Amino acid sequence: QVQLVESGGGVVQPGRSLRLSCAASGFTFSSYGMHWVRQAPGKGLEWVAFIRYDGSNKYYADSVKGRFTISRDNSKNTLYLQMNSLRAEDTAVYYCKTHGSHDNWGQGTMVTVSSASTKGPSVFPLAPSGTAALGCLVKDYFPEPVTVSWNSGALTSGVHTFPAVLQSSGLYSLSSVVTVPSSSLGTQTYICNVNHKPSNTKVDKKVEPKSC
Amino acid sequence: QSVLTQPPSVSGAPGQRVTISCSGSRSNIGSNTVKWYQQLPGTAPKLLIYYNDQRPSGVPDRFSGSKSGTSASLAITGLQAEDEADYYCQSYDRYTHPALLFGTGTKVTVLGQPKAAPSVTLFPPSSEELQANKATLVCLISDFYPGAVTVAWKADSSPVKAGVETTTPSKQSNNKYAASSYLSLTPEQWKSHRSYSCQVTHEGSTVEKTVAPTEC
Secondary structure, X not given: OOEEEEEOOEEEOOOOOEEEEEEEEOOOHHHOOEEEEEEOOOOOEEEEEEEOOOOOOEEEOOOOOOOEEEEEEOXXXXXXXXXXXXXXXXXXXXXXEEOOOOOXXXXXXXXXXXXXXXXXXXXXXXXXXXXXXXXXXXXXEEOOOOEEEEHXXXXXXXXXXXXXXXXXXXXXXXXXXEEEEHHHHOOOOEEEEEEEHHHOEEEEEEEOOOOO | OOOEEOOOEEEEOOOOEEEEEEEOOOOOOOXXXXXXXXXXXXXXXXXXXXXXXXXXXXXXXXXXXXXXXXXXXXXXXXXXXXXXXXEEEEEOOOOOOOOOEEEOOEEEEEOOOOXXXXXXXXXXXXHXXXXXXXXXXXXXXXXXXXOOOEEEEEEOOEEEOOOEEEOOOEEOOOOOEEEEEEEEEOHHHHHOOOOEEEEEEEOOEEEEEEEOOOOO
């Protein structure tokens, strides 16, 4: 029963070091070369490094060469990835994979490299320019989640709060839009109610038509 | 360095046949064998094909691999709902070399509803944000199926590389997909061009929305 279990991942700031481990069992670990493969959220697979069955030779991708070091302890049936001088672009799930025709992968371990701390969002109105669309921009906050309502919850029809984008800086940004009739744009008032509990930020922003 | 190009999205109805291409060069696919992997959400890739066309035990024979010249292909004959997933080809670059080259990845959608083009809404930077010496263009994309889009930003007519942040498609409450793309600009860049455009390509068709600084 082949089994690979990665560990050592977590949240770290750029420039710091992290050591990943992959415990192997159910097969002769010392007879197989081993790979590290990573996958940033929503992106493709990227090969990271490879080590021969006996550790005699090591191979690295250019993006990690000089910063990561692959190693293995065959007496311990464990594979290691020493990651130094970590950068934001190293954020990814890191998988441990055997080398061969019939290969096996572990479940992966998540690595998040970010210098982001608790921060409340900056809310900006998305003014509308017989159905017109208006919203708010909830910009640069950390961590999730953010709750957005309209008119203290009285306006729920046609509301679409989009999932947040995770920026390279490690901060989040989302937008909430409401589709309303163009006729009620001059009479009705539209307030988006933003709440960011981690930073104790609650904002009520009024969205008005753009006028010179 | 070397890239194995795959189509971003392929789709077919249940029971239909789809193929996924994997284009390389003489050095890699032209000189090495190809693997194919299936990846479901939140799990590690799973081996489907090795040695170009060999199926591991337990892989249904409706998954068939082939290779010719510098290109490889994965065919799925008789799509089933469970086949909706990401698919990656994998090969090597030199002779008897160990570094793995993974393809760009293909999202396979098993069509459970008619194809739907995205609705695009492009918002300019608000006055409050520009007063803070910041500028963000918000391109909101909704009600499209399959859930695969490519977003391209244009300054006037020139492509924009820096400042783009795009989410992965997520299924809406109405079971269509939504995505958002943000273009971070300085107030000077936003006012030094006559317009900015968000181009959303979906199933070969492009939907463009343009915004200008003058219009208030």
